[PDB]
Design a binder for this molecule. Structure first.
Ligand SMILES: CSc1ccccc1CC(=O)N1C[C@H](C(N)=O)C[C@H](C(N)=O)C1
Ligand SMILES: [Zn+2]
Length: 139
């Protein structure tokens, strides 16, 4: 679980969005596993606008932060799951690091701000949905 709170927006994994997220929907994209809902309170986070490929992410299944080197956002095949058919997920960045399904929502940050959230993983891999291209999150 986890979310980004920026301005009057809440960014979550689309597959973990609540009934309240859908009732306050701003934008969603199944191919990216992202959903953005509106909030009444002002957020605590800021978004990176950069091309960093290193950063630190929070791993709830270890209660720890880990440093990572990750690939640039790209179209990657993700096998069928409880929430999606087998498909290509876009804007996904992979890295070597521990993750389990419940780690989705953990934030990845670089020196410039929030980069994205955990969205996929595997046998010693962790994948992050990028948010740096969503320029409208800052206005
Ligand atoms: C950190 S996730 C992880 C980690 C280790 C091993 C397996 C996973 C699960 C994972 O990769 N999923 C893909 C995700 C998606 N973005 O399509 C939907 C997730 C779901 N709950 O249906 C399953
Ligand atoms: Zn950066």
């Amino acid at each position: 679980s986890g979310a980004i709170y920026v301005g009057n927006y809440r960014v979550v994994n689309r597959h973990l969005a609540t009934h309240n997220d859908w009732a306050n929907l701003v934008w969603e994209d199944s191919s990216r596993d992202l959903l953005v809902s509106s909030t009444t309170a002002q957020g605590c986070d800021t978004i990176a606008r950069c091309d960093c490929q290193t950063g630190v992410y929070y791993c709830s299944s270890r209660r720890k932060h880990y440093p990572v080197s990750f690939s640039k956002p790209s179209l990657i095949f993700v096998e069928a799951s409880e929430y999606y058919p087998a498909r290509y997920q876009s804007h996904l960045m992979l890295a070597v690091g521990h993750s389990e399904p419940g780690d989705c929502g953990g934030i990845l940050r670089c020196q410039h701000g929030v980069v994205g959230i955990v969205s996929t993983g595997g046998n010693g891999l962790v994948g992050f949905a990028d948010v740096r291209d969503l320029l409208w999150l800052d206005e």
